Amino acid sequence: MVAFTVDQMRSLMDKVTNVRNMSVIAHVDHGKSTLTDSLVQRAGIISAAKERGITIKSTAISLYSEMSDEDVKEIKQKTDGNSFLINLIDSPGHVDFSSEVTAALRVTDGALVVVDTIEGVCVQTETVLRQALGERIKPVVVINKVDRALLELQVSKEDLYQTFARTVESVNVIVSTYADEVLGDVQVYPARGTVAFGSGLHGWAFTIRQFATRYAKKFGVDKAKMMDRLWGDSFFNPKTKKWTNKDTDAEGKPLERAFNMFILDPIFRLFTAIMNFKKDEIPVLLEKLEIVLKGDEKDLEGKALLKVVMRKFLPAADALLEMIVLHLPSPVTAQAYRAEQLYEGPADDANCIAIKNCDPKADLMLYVSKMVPTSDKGRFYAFGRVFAGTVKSGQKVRIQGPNYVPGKKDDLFIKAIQRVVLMMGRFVEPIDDCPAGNIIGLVGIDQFLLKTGTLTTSETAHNMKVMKFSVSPVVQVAVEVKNANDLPKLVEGLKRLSKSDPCVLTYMSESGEHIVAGTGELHLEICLQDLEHDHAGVPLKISPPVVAYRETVESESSQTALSKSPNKHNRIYLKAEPIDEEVSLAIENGIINPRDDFKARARIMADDYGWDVTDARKIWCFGPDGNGPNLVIDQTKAVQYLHEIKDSVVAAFQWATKEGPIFGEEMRSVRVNILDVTLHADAIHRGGGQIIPTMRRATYAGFLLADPKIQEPVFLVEIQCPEQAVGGIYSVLNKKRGQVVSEEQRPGTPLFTVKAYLPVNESFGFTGELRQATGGQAFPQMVFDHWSTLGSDPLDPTSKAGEIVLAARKRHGMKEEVPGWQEYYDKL
Ligand SMILES: C=C1CO[C@@H]2[C@@H](C)O[C@@H](OC[C@@]34C[C@@H]5[C@H](C)[C@H](Cl)C[C@H]5[C@@]5(C=O)C[C@@H]3C=C(C(C)C)[C@@]45C(=O)O)C[C@@H]12
Ligand SMILES: Nc1nc2c(ncn2[C@@H]2O[C@H](COP(=O)(O)OP(=O)(O)O)[C@@H](O)[C@H]2O)c(=O)[nH]1
């Protein structure tokens, strides 16, 4: 549109009182693009001077505009000259709530909210506006698609007005409701020229002020008052030739409002005449309004003409530009009431002040809004705003991350800025510097600032409103080699991955699978990628990690269990019953140890865990692995060669409990009581290969008679997030048998710390699903917490648990049926 040299741009960048950092806030289909596009063609700036080339993803655009000596006097705000530099920063239309959006606005001071003439203000509209308000962004309105109502609906004039009327009122509800008391009445007033009406597709729009001036010069009145009248309850009676503050002429008759008589009328008459082909009235009407056509335009018809005559009548572009310049704040103005909020430090601090003043001579205070993709071979550029001091190419800056703390040296990076550039839509342009108050990009920060961050030149500097990260590994899957022979390389490469990525984690699952875990899904992504193509460079099959379970019993076996050796000579009679959870834990945590003296040990189980004191000294072993939470207590009476079979009964128990009868999982909280034992006179028939199997079977039998169940692992998740999104937590948690434990708020500033239990086998995907429910606001952090017995029957293929088992057996190539106890029991 207009081309400027790089110097010209720096000159404009010097008068920051004539700059406007804004964006366009709008609903999903309200003309946000046809409208900004309209502006761009009118005022868009372009690079002056104009296999190999460079490009960046559009993130901002620059518009230039000159005003009239008079229009610059209505600017109730420190100005400097007839010129202006508008910054049209792009914002995410459809992206989740608070992350992509919040960050973008933060570098804007004003907004241009687009509302629809028919649908009025919808949810999203009200949502982003509330968002913008939160950061104290002043709103200015534009009701769009006024053409739909004029054609399709055929609406009246007072009908339409009333619409505009409402739409304005709702917006003013949201305004007052979320506006900082200290900022004053930011409510939009059509009569004050802060609300524009028009059609972005047709190309026309208008503010009341534009009409209040048209009529102001001709008939000789000051517009101050002509504006107040041209909207609301002010009527002008042709007859009385005077105005009134009541909608009824003395005689009791209804009059026509000004807005309708002086604004809408002219318009309506033009539609109706050109849209009905009244080739005789068009000429006289156009003449009357002072709309001159040129050349072949004189012979247009219908829609073709409505657009020409309408765009000449009220160029959408000038209405928008008006409001922008005359009502939206400049940095100098906004950075004064927006300084505290954007600074996380002392509101009296040296820097926090250089923001308010928007002083380019203070200590650098540049905020990075986001990292933008570019054709420069995988390099990203930093897009942000210079809030204080000034940036320079090759400058030495202190890059502070989201965790950085003034004292502590974490997230801090004392590197230098390669180049400072202009982000002109899809193109960039190098410059020498950029003072406080502007929008610029930075090349060479890539690797030190992932996303949001603050750049400073002061060592006693604080960070600007920062965004929190997820830094614990949580996203994990099971990695395995496709050709068994590559195993050595998979292993080889897992130590390679770890040695390079300090934010990755690798380990062996209880169920023997190698495991890769990472920060986010994107992180795991890059990780598994490199692993298979460089670290290990071997084909791998990635999958959800297999969960381990615990086979346990619910009560004392309904009946005694019997089992005879394959000698038909020796028999064993036992029963199984549950061990208490507080106890099982004690065994697990080593408070009750099989290696500790019977002295200390006997004491603890009697004097601290209710165990009958005699019991303590008749346990033969804990298991599996000699020290697990399962006991074999000897309750026999007159077995001659008892002490003779002990060593065997033990090795049998250490086997049974390592791989239970349900599906081979480890048993937990299982206490086996041997009620009696009968042996053969000779030791030649009570050997190992005779007793071991007897006990193995015997135990299984008692076990299944004891109302079997299974225990599932359970995580203990911790979450941090803003008060509003604490809803998503409970939202998703419910869809996964979750359970909120505690909800504590960190004193100081909003950020809740939700804590809950999460069934390990309901956690695949959780991290992602969380991002959604909270629009990228919360970040999880898991850890194993405990075992929990499932209520359902493990031998009923259809029950919850029973499905868990079933699939398991199929995965192992075992029978789908779980051999009931009868299979192990040997009746007398
Ligand atoms: C989310 C994270 C981040 O890093 C942590 C790592 C260190 O520990 C992880 O905790 C991993 C656990 C730890 C416990 C206990 C050892 C008892 Cl025996 C039962 C096991 C589990 C088995 O079902 C239950 C948990 C989820 C698993 C696999 C599905 C991978 C487990 C495993 O096999 O290691 C949680 C991870
Ligand atoms: N009649 C009419 N259609 C419009 C107007 N503004 C936008 N549209 C149409 O609405 C649709 C969506 O508009 P667009 O600007 O892409 O919406 P966005 O999603 O807000 O960017 C398109 O088909 C446009 O042609 C307008 O003022 N009048």
PDB file of C-alpha atoms and ligand atoms in Angstrom, residues 472-474 476 505 507-511 515 517 545-550 713-715 760 782-784 787, ligand 1:
ATOM      1  CA  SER A 472       8.455 -33.057  35.854  1.00  0.00           C
ATOM      2  CA  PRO A 473       8.373 -36.052  33.576  1.00  0.00           C
ATOM      3  CA  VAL A 474       4.808 -37.328  33.297  1.00  0.00           C
ATOM      4  CA  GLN A 476       5.635 -41.821  29.258  1.00  0.00           C
ATOM      5  CA  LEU A 505      13.718 -39.947  32.049  1.00  0.00           C
ATOM      6  CA  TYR A 507      13.691 -46.643  33.570  1.00  0.00           C
ATOM      7  CA  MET A 508      12.493 -50.220  33.897  1.00  0.00           C
ATOM      8  CA  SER A 509       8.896 -50.875  34.733  1.00  0.00           C
ATOM      9  CA  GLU A 510       7.964 -53.292  37.479  1.00  0.00           C
ATOM     10  CA  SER A 511       6.727 -55.345  34.530  1.00  0.00           C
ATOM     11  CA  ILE A 515      10.381 -46.747  29.646  1.00  0.00           C
ATOM     12  CA  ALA A 517       9.083 -40.355  30.107  1.00  0.00           C
ATOM     13  CA  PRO A 545       3.253 -49.052  29.435  1.00  0.00           C
ATOM     14  CA  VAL A 546       1.923 -52.257  31.003  1.00  0.00           C
ATOM     15  CA  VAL A 547       0.507 -51.901  34.542  1.00  0.00           C
ATOM     16  CA  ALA A 548       1.327 -54.260  37.385  1.00  0.00           C
ATOM     17  CA  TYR A 549      -1.218 -55.655  39.801  1.00  0.00           C
ATOM     18  CA  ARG A 550      -1.271 -57.455  43.121  1.00  0.00           C
ATOM     19  CA  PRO A 713      -1.544 -49.074  41.490  1.00  0.00           C
ATOM     20  CA  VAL A 714      -2.657 -45.524  42.175  1.00  0.00           C
ATOM     21  CA  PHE A 715      -0.803 -42.263  41.448  1.00  0.00           C
ATOM     22  CA  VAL A 760      -2.542 -45.710  37.150  1.00  0.00           C
ATOM     23  CA  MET A 782       2.561 -37.831  39.241  1.00  0.00           C
ATOM     24  CA  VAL A 783       3.991 -40.326  41.674  1.00  0.00           C
ATOM     25  CA  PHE A 784       3.001 -43.825  42.844  1.00  0.00           C
ATOM     26  CA  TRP A 787      -2.475 -50.090  46.073  1.00  0.00           C
TER      27      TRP A 787
HETATM   28  C1  LIG B   1       5.173 -39.874  36.249  1.00  0.00           C
HETATM   29  C2  LIG B   1       6.386 -40.292  36.599  1.00  0.00           C
HETATM   30  C3  LIG B   1       7.663 -39.481  36.532  1.00  0.00           C
HETATM   31  O1  LIG B   1       8.715 -40.387  36.927  1.00  0.00           O
HETATM   32  C4  LIG B   1       8.036 -41.328  37.758  1.00  0.00           C
HETATM   33  C5  LIG B   1       8.807 -42.649  37.942  1.00  0.00           C
HETATM   34  C6  LIG B   1      10.108 -42.415  38.679  1.00  0.00           C
HETATM   35  O2  LIG B   1       8.002 -43.555  38.721  1.00  0.00           O
HETATM   36  C7  LIG B   1       6.729 -43.857  38.064  1.00  0.00           C
HETATM   37  O3  LIG B   1       5.946 -44.768  38.806  1.00  0.00           O
HETATM   38  C8  LIG B   1       5.868 -45.948  38.019  1.00  0.00           C
HETATM   39  C9  LIG B   1       5.015 -47.096  38.665  1.00  0.00           C
HETATM   40  C10 LIG B   1       5.704 -47.288  40.115  1.00  0.00           C
HETATM   41  C11 LIG B   1       5.062 -48.381  40.995  1.00  0.00           C
HETATM   42  C12 LIG B   1       5.849 -49.007  42.188  1.00  0.00           C
HETATM   43  C13 LIG B   1       7.341 -49.302  41.874  1.00  0.00           C
HETATM   44  C14 LIG B   1       4.956 -50.257  42.577  1.00  0.00           C
HETATM   45 CL1  LIG B   1       5.723 -51.747  42.680  1.00  0.00          CL
HETATM   46  C15 LIG B   1       4.026 -50.456  41.331  1.00  0.00           C
HETATM   47  C16 LIG B   1       4.678 -49.643  40.176  1.00  0.00           C
HETATM   48  C17 LIG B   1       3.860 -49.218  38.892  1.00  0.00           C
HETATM   49  C18 LIG B   1       3.287 -50.449  38.153  1.00  0.00           C
HETATM   50  O4  LIG B   1       2.122 -50.596  37.772  1.00  0.00           O
HETATM   51  C19 LIG B   1       2.769 -48.125  39.170  1.00  0.00           C
HETATM   52  C20 LIG B   1       3.479 -46.879  38.570  1.00  0.00           C
HETATM   53  C21 LIG B   1       3.247 -46.884  37.079  1.00  0.00           C
HETATM   54  C22 LIG B   1       4.097 -47.873  36.575  1.00  0.00           C
HETATM   55  C23 LIG B   1       4.279 -48.326  35.115  1.00  0.00           C
HETATM   56  C24 LIG B   1       2.993 -48.292  34.282  1.00  0.00           C
HETATM   57  C25 LIG B   1       5.332 -47.471  34.409  1.00  0.00           C
HETATM   58  C26 LIG B   1       4.860 -48.420  37.860  1.00  0.00           C
HETATM   59  C27 LIG B   1       6.141 -49.251  37.442  1.00  0.00           C
HETATM   60  O5  LIG B   1       5.898 -50.334  36.846  1.00  0.00           O
HETATM   61  O6  LIG B   1       7.286 -48.767  37.705  1.00  0.00           O
HETATM   62  C28 LIG B   1       5.905 -42.570  37.867  1.00  0.00           C
HETATM   63  C29 LIG B   1       6.768 -41.650  37.029  1.00  0.00           C
END
